[PDB]
Amino acid sequence: HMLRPVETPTREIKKLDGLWAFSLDRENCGIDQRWWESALQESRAIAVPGSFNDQFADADIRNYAGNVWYQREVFIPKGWAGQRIVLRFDAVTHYGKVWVNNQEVMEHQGGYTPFEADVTPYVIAGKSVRITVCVNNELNWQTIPPGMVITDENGKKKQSYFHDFFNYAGIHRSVMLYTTPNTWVDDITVVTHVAQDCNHASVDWQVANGDVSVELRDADQQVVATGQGTSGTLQVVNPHLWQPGEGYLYELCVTAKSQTECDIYPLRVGIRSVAVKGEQFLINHKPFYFTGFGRHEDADLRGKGFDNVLMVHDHALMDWIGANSYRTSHYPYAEEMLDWADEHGIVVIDETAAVGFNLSLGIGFENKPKELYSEEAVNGETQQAHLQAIKELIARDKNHPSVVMWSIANEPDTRPQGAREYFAPLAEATRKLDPTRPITCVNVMFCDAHTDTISDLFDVLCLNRYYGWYVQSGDLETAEKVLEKELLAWQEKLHQPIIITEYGVDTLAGLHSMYTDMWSEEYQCAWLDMYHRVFDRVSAVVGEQVWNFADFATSQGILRVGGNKKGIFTRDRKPKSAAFLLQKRWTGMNFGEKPQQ
Amino acid sequence: HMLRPVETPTREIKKLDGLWAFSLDRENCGIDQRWWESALQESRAIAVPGSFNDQFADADIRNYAGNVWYQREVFIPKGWAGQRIVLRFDAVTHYGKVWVNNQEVMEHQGGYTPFEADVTPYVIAGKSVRITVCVNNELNWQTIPPGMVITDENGKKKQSYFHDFFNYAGIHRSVMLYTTPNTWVDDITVVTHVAQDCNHASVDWQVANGDVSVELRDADQQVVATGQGTSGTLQVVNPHLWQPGEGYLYELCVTAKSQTECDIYPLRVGIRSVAVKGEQFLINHKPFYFTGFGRHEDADLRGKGFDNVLMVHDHALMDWIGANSYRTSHYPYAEEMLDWADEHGIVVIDETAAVGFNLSLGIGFENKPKELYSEEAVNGETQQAHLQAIKELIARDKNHPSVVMWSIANEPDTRPQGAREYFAPLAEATRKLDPTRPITCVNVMFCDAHTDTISDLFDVLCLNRYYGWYVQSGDLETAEKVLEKELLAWQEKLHQPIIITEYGVDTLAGLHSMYTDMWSEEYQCAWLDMYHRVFDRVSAVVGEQVWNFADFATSQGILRVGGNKKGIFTRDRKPKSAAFLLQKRWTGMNFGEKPQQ
Numbered sequence A, B: 001h002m003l004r005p006v007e008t009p010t011r012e013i014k015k016l017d018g019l020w021a022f023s024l025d026r027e028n029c030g031i032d033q034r035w036w037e038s039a040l041q042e043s044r045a046i047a048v049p050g051s052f053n054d055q056f057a058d059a060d061i062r063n064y065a066g067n068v069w070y071q072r073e074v075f076i077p078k079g080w081a082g083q084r085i086v087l088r089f090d091a092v093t094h095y096g097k098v099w100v101n102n103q104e105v106m107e108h109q110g111g112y113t114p115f116e117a118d119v120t121p122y123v124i125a126g127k128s129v130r131i132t133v134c135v136n137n138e139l140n141w142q143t144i145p146p147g148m149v150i151t152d153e154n155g156k157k158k159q160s161y162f163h164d165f166f167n168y169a170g171i172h173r174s175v176m177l178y179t180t181p182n183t184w185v186d187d188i189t190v191v192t193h194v195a196q197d198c199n200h201a202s203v204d205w206q207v208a209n210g211d212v213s214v215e216l217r218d219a220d221q222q223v224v225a226t227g228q229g230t231s232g233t234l235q236v237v238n239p240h241l242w243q244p245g246e247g248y249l250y251e252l253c254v255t256a257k258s259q260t261e262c263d264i265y266p267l268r269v270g271i272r273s274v275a276v277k278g279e280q281f282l283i284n285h286k287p288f289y290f291t292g293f294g295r296h297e298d299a300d301l302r303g304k305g306f307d308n309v310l311m312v313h314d315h316a317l318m319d320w321i322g323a324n325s326y327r328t329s330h331y332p333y334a335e336e337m338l339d340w341a342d343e344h345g346i347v348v349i350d351e352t353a354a355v356g357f358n359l360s361l362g363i364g365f366e367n368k369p370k371e372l373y374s375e376e377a378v379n380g381e382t383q384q385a386h387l388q389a390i391k392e393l394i395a396r397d398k399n400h401p402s403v404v405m406w407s408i409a410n411e412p413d414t415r416p417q418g419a420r421e422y423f424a425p426l427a428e429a430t431r432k433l434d435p436t437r438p439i440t441c442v443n444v445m446f447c448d449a450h451t452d453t454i455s456d457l458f459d460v461l462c463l464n465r466y467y468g469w470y471v472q473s474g475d476l477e478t479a480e481k482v483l484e485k486e487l488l489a490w491q492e493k494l495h496q497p498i499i500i501t502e503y504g505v506d507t508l509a510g511l512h513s514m515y516t517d518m519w520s521e522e523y524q525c526a527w528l529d530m531y532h533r534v535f536d537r538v539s540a541v542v543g544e545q546v547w548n549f550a551d552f553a554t555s556q557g558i559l560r561v562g563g564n565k566k567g568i569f570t571r572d573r574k575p576k577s578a579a580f581l582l583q584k585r586w587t588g589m590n591f592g593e594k595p596q597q
């Protein structure tokens, strides 16, 4: 049971603020020598939140595999003698184990979701405790995402993985201590139903030794509904709906009264209905059309570290270009992202970190498990770890009205028997963990309409298609034919709504061509344009998401010229020519509505 | 009297073909030691045609001022015992003096026009003579263009000049030996009149001890007119006219019969009428609208050297983009250019090399004659040299139907009294040297409508305007207002047709901006677009020529990031985004007709 921290009977002191002591451990003696005991040797200042790889311009820190130590002292605020205090890590990429002054208090696997522990017994209010963090950036076959650690003859660990983006690690987001009353709200769940768009209710179901009443206050803070019951309610309402263009928010505030002290938790709600009918995706009983991007949490110097200016600027760009939706590509994003999405009515495809369950999308000319689904590779523990990743993503983003669909994985290889054996239970478990949202699994190119094995276990079909790029390279005529043929094949086979969640081409900013050859800005424009002409001719396609909003870092190889260049913007957010192409189509269309051509 | 070499009683052996011996002369002892006597010492292979500056990747050859020696042996063809043979240099940039085996035979000042000498007495037919050329790249106040040589304390000559483009030198074009019969055509002049577009004649006037008859053969080689008379004729005709879109060519062939031997010269003619009426420029009695470029003869490695692939490719680009006209910016171009223009119906503004008669367009923070028009600077000899440059340009391109206007100079400073004193006689002398074409002088920005002194001495007003770039920098709103105000002021003051012969902005390929700030591709697009919206609101503007077709080399300075970047194409001919902007406007308009907005 987890909620995002906020105010009044609750209060934060964040240690996000500032520089920590940081150290490597090339021989992994930190645990043996109990480094959490003393203040570190060999410590250098590092900034949190932020990846550790790019911060020191050193290829050895950058390419490190192992454990790293983050440590900082802090003064525990003194008006906190009688309240309950928690230590919350909003993300520690891959694995983290924390000591609060010689006392292990938490441990976590999963680099993208928050994890907290009550630390009341282990701290002296009014004085300073020392926080030590042990961070592991290693991936094996039971981590979400999977990878393999390669140890050379000399014990240097080098991490290989099967996804594009670079394996940035560290404390990527918020680290804070926050206090709730000893009687406190611990979890909230809100569900919205709507009929003729002027007439429904907000079911609730709450959970910590406190009798609870909930007021549903206005944007004007005018109250229009009231309930009581730990097992919640159905507050019935005639309302203004949370819509894609505007995203209205009521405020449902839950009051947890114990007979002495009280706690109250403010939770914003968007009144909207999501469903799939035939080949139509409907938000509030109207067929929506998705436009926008796959994104990444990547940026210069800070890696995957959260940054407010970046969020403000990237939403300004996305707003300008006319995007209405995005997918949290290949891991759960910072919650600040989803909060922004709620206030602005941005439609979001929420996705777990389950990427790389595929051993066919390689560079060439170089020792893998020859069976993807097996005891050596993706096995039962992997499945359990995956289900737990689904449970953490859902427990954190269930109430967000902007999250409109759950993505279980991205681009697994579905051809082997055992893909369906691995995925079907996860598809079912996910539906039972949130029956109010449709479910998806993003589908790779070579698992075509004929060969794919699991897409009928999901509500929406999300395709990643690169005809004319990785195959039929340079050939816009042939690729157009292939793309039309496979889209009609998919619509014939499943009669589900189709979103093209990935389509894009590597483009060097400033490379121009009078031909329309690959890597050129002219080719990025003509290729996106040919895709758009096809989408507009297939009734089932309800959504387009250009593969990347910006250029991002990847591991080194012959396929990646300083990373992935499929961005519409450069890594410093400057637009390639295709940006204006996109802006013309996406602002020239009626909002949320499929282009009539 | 000069004509371009061609065939049958005439025949070429070109020494353009191939590598010559080349040498510097840092102490100028080549003339004293009569290097033309022997085969050179210290000689390295060099390619002709082509500048010498960029060919060796050496900054000292590149930045040299002085004399250089070109020398090659050649075998004089033996079936040339009884015909007359000439040595023709199509261009030797700035100055050249040639010895044909210890016999000075020619000398020339003027780096852009051909010069030839009969060499019959000085050669043994059937054996090989040695050709030595002395080339000077220096500019003083009596050269077209003017410059000043700066000699430092150690006698190193460094050339300063007052124009943008780099002072490339050498043998830039064709060097050939060609034979005519001892009775030969020596000069031709053709004039075209046309009334209701189905009804007029071709006046002629011919000139070398030969009785002459002229047949006017078809594209089908069908004869439709015939004359005789050294003093020519008026062949009256009902015809298909030389038009801008197509450029039909008759062939007028002149037959020079002596009683024994004969010579005949083929000369293509375009039947078209050019005139100015009010604020209208008419080709064949219809108002034309100019689109296209200022160009340059500049390209990688070869400098200003002529190259056939470059001509084919640049015309393919210009054709694609929709350009119908161009100005031979800042010197006469290769005649092959004007021949191409004739066959393709490209309208050309022909311009002399008289650039830099202005000492106000400088970079800053650095000794010039404080009076531009004076004995120290532009004086009477400069005027005579300028008139001779006008005479050479006109004698070479008079018959070309594509040449539709003569440009006397580019961007002189007209404010001082003495600008009108210098220019008026040249304007008159030019009208009397070709009364069939309108006359222009390209006008610089700071000689505004109020202050300019000489524009009323010319038929067409050609403006070079850079509001929003060099002034009101970045400000599209303010610059738009200024540009409209000055264009209406010019139309009010002179009621002449206005061509904007220069408008452009420096643009780094691949620099992009979400603002529309300078040096960005987005700014090049928005600035050209604002100019186009203004032009379309002023009745007198009949022509637009974006300043540069491609990026070109300039001398070093703080204003030029690796040269001038105002090109629409890069120096390797790849398009910036604005190229598509241009292609949309220029191909979306009715041909030769002003955009109705």
Ligand SMILES: CCCCCC[C@@H]1NC[C@@H](O)[C@H](O)[C@H]1C(=O)O
Pocket (backbone or CB within 6 Å): A164, A165, A330, A361, A411, A444, A445, A446, A464, A466, A470, A502, A564, A566
């Ligand atoms: C032949 C199949 C090619 C799959 C390649 C498409 C990949 N999908 C997942 C994304 O994270 C990658 O960046 C994308 C790519 O490589 O740019």
Ligand SMILES: CCCCCC[C@@H]1NC[C@@H](O)[C@H](O)[C@H]1C(=O)O
Pocket (backbone or CB within 6 Å): B164, B165, B330, B361, B411, B444, B445, B446, B464, B466, B470, B502, B564, B566
């Ligand atoms: C303030 C007046 C500025 C004049 C500058 C305009 C110049 N006209 C002549 C061209 O040869 C130059 O390239 C152009 C420029 O500099 O790019």
